[PDB]
Design a binder for this molecule. Structure first.
Ligand code: 6RI
Length: 375
């Protein structure tokens, strides 16, 4: 098993197992607003309602799950406050009452004070029936922004890919154990098992089309996930009133923030963070937007010896093929992600009376992955 300090679950991987839904009664004023985002945003009273809050101490958030739920609550409210109805009228100052505890909590959890993937995917879910399995029909999100925003489909399908990935993640220790102990047959089997699970993950990824509509994603959800780093709407970032005097820039939610998005690249020695380019920069930067336990896990993967070099040094076509099977599965996942950006961002952007930067990042990532094929 993976060490408990890395907060990786056998079943759900990097996802937070059975997330907490309700905070203490002390935080009811946060919870009410977060649970009623569709109505409060629509009616133009979210902002005043945030502005009416008293400053609540973070001391009553005792356990990790309650602390993560509070991050999810505060993060969603923050995006709602900043972006409002999503029509370009923006707040450049986050009020003291909310900003101080959010930044305090964020400092405690070692995450930046913005909604990240780890909040809105990994901690933003529940089973409808706890006795039934982890499928789309038996699941839903904890929070959404707007009616018809497709947050359920977008967050949960991301989560399901993340859960499919967990089957591969748990094999990682078998890979490194097999190398140090020089167990070629065991290593071969482990790599084939990883390939299998990543192929399954791709089939799970196909569900995005069933539950997410392009127009709604591009024109609504994408707006609420946007950040204030290199964003002309908040050119100098966002003022967190009471915590920092000067405005600070933070990137919005991204698949690049997923630990699965990087961990197989690291495992297999696909040097995604090498070469000094923009994509390498972004992936490294996005480790700061992951929970510390997961950044630490990626660190420990880096610090183990290279699987690529081991396979390359052995003159073993069988091992080479099992490694390539992993690389090829990653290639297909990257290609599929690209196809999704085309349908969900590029095309809607063209029909509107930008998205290229994301496409270029992903093309770089895919290209690097292809170039790692040994045959
Ligand atoms: O953008 C996405 N979700 C997202 C959610 C919240 C947010 F704040 C921002 C974004 C989508 C996506 C989901 C999974 C991958 C993915 C793809 N490939 C690998 C791989 F590394 F295994 F190849 C891992 C993941 C990670 O599991 C890529 C995108 C959903 O449909 C787009």
């Amino acid at each position: 098993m993976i060490s408990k300090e890395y907060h990786i679950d056998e079943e759900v991987g990097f996802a937070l197992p059975n997330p907490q839904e309700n905070l203490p009664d002390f935080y009811n004023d946060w919870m009410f607003i977060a649970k009623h985002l569709p109505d409060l945003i629509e009616s133009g009273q979210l902002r005043e309602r945030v502005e009416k809050l008293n400053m609540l101490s973070i001391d009553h958030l005792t356990d990790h799950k309650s602390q993560r739920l509070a991050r999810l609550v505060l993060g969603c409210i923050t995006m709602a406050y900043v972006w409002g109805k999503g029509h370009g009228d923006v707040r450049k100052v986050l009020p003291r009452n909310i900003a101080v505890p959010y930044c305090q909590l964020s400092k405690k959890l070692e995450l930046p004070p913005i909604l990240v993937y780890a909040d809105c995917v990994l901690a933003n879910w529940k089973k409808k029936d706890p006795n039934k399995p982890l499928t789309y029909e038996n699941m839903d999100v904890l929070f959404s922004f707007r009616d018809g925003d497709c947050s359920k489909g977008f967050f949960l399908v991301s989560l399901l890919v993340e859960i499919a990935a967990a089957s591969a993640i748990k094999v990682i220790p078998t890979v490194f154990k097999a190398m140090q102990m020089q167990e070629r047959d065991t290593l071969l089997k482990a790599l084939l098992e990883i390939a299998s699970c990543l192929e399954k993950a791709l089939q799970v990824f196909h569900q995005i089309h069933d539950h997410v509509n392009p127009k709604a994603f591009f024109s609504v959800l994408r707006i609420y996930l946007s950040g204030w780093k290199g964003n002309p709407q908040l050119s100098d970032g966002l003022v967190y009133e009471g915590f920092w005097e000067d405005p600070k820039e933070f990137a919005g939610g991204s698949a690049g923030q997923s630990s699965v998005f990087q961990c197989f690249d690291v495992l297999l020695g696909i040097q995604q963070t090498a070469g000094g380019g923009h994509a390498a920069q972004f992936l490294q930067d996005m480790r700061r937007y992951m929970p510390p336990a997961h950044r630490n896990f990626l660190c420990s993967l880096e610090s183990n010896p290279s699987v690529r070099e081991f396979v390359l040094s052995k003159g073993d076509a069988g091992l080479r093929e099992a490694y390539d099977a992993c690389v090829k599965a990653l290639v297909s996942l990257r290609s599929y992600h690209l196809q999704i950006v085309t349908k969900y961002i590029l095309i809607p952007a063209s029909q509107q009376p930008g998205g290229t930067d994301l496409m270029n990042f992903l093309k770089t990532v895919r290209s690097t992955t292809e170039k790692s094929l040994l045959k």
